[PDB]
């Protein structure tokens with residue numbers, strides 16, 4: 001297969017696939033065939049990813065968005081792209097000025113007692129019947145979701161439908177099912193905005209109303225935030241928990257020392273996914289990078305965790321070392337595109353690991369890790385299940 005194809009099934013969890021390892025050793029920027037069947041440029045190395053994150057010729061913009069080369073087939077992902085390059089710039093700037101104040105240090109610090117309290121409640125439900133239990137579906141997802149709902153302003157009576165609607169939102173190669181969850185989610189969130197415009201509450205939707213006069217527009221905006229943080233946080237709770245099970249003496253040191261726990265969270269972010277953490281861009285003009293020229297209109301695949309195994313940056317990247325320092329991973333991106341939820345994601349993760357392992361020090365897998373499976377055909381795909389006992 002020339003160019004190499006990315007849809008090479010799914011590698012085992014917590015391991016860098018042979019395909020991606022050879023692509024990275026081959027060149028910093030590689031032409032590949034995407035899961036959707038089109039052609040794209042995979043950025044494989046740390047320095048080149050950083051450079052492209054700071055190059056204003058990469059954008060969520062294309063002269064013909066409907067016909068542009070695709071990474072995967074998903075209409076919700078397609079909503080990030082507009083056909084006017086000036087409009088793409090101003091929309092991106094606007095979105096960052098809307099969202100950045102919601103994740104200030106004061107706000108995340110102030111939310112933290114609430115985050116810890118939500119973790120405690122989810123844990124009670126997770127352990128209520130004793131072991132074994134599914135860490136993914138009965139702790140990681142409900143905890144990740146309850147935090148996002150508390151911050152965004154989704155009441156309890158609607159959180160039950162969210163996991164379902166958000167699941168069908170991420171489905172690949174089924175535009176009709178993505179449209180269903182899109183309909184259901186956009187209608188739910190914009191109705192909340194209509195209410196909170198009249199009766200403001202301490203949540204993000206209420207504060208978005210003060211700068212976004214359209215309730216309709218708050219639908220996709222809020223949906224973006226939820227989808228950006230739900231599976232991303234949940235899957236890192238899952239995989240970080242496995243990494244800790246596999247490295248008990250490092251887990252013991254992280255539990256005894258908060259600074260070591262912060263380092264451990266960073267090492268889990270660096271290494272848990274081990275490639276495949278791709279978001280797309282398009283070139284709006286020719287971009288020379290490494291020894292190739294990305295052409296205007298071309299698809300560019302930014303893989304934010306493949307670069308965390310770049311041997312020219314990380315010594316022994318395949319080893320889990322919570323004391324790794326410095327730890328310049330790019331899991332949250334960089335620059336003008338840097339993940340706005342990163343401070344919240346970090347609090348969620350250290351809250352989860354701290355609570356889980358102090359309450360359940362015997363946590364272990366029910367079956368060998370080789371038997372875990374990632375859901376297929378899913379944007380932001382996580383484990384089907386994570387059975388644990390304690």
Ligand SMILES: C[C@@H]1[C@H](O)[C@@H](C)/C=C/C=C/CC/C=C/C=C/C=C/C=C/[C@H](O[C@@H]2O[C@H](C)[C@@H](O)[C@H](N)[C@@H]2O)C[C@@H]2O[C@](O)(C[C@@H](O)[C@H](O)CC[C@@H](O)C[C@@H](O)C[C@@H](O)CC(=O)O[C@H]1C)C[C@H](O)[C@H]2C(=O)O
Pocket residue numbers: 072076077079080091092094095217220221222223224225227228229231232235273275276277278279339378379380381382
């Ligand atoms: C300007 C507009 C307009 O006015 C309005 C009218 C339009 C709004 C448009 C809304 C549509 C939003 C787009 C969502 C797409 C998500 C794709 C996720 C893909 C996830 C990928 O997954 C893969 O999939 C493959 C198939 C599998 O083979 C792989 N093994 C793997 O699983 C990679 C996963 O990514 C990360 O997860 C983080 C991502 O979430 C981030 O945090 C959000 C980034 C992005 O979402 C930012 C937006 O979301 C912010 C949004 O808010 C913008 C916004 O409204 O602007 C408003 C103001 C973390 C996971 O570790 C990583 C992972 O899994 O490795």
Ligand code: HEM
Pocket residue numbers: 096099148225228229230232233236279280302304330331332333336337338339340341342344345
């Ligand atoms: C461990 C969990 C998470 C990871 C690994 C992660 C990763 C990322 C990455 C790599 C990007 C850059 C995407 C690109 O350049 O196209 C990004 C952007 C973004 N993330 Fe996250 N994220 C996480 C959690 C969250 C959470 C919890 C939220 C919201 C509560 C969030 C909201 C956003 C937003 C709004 C953007 C768009 C920034 C922009 O377009 O300039 N993320 N995230």
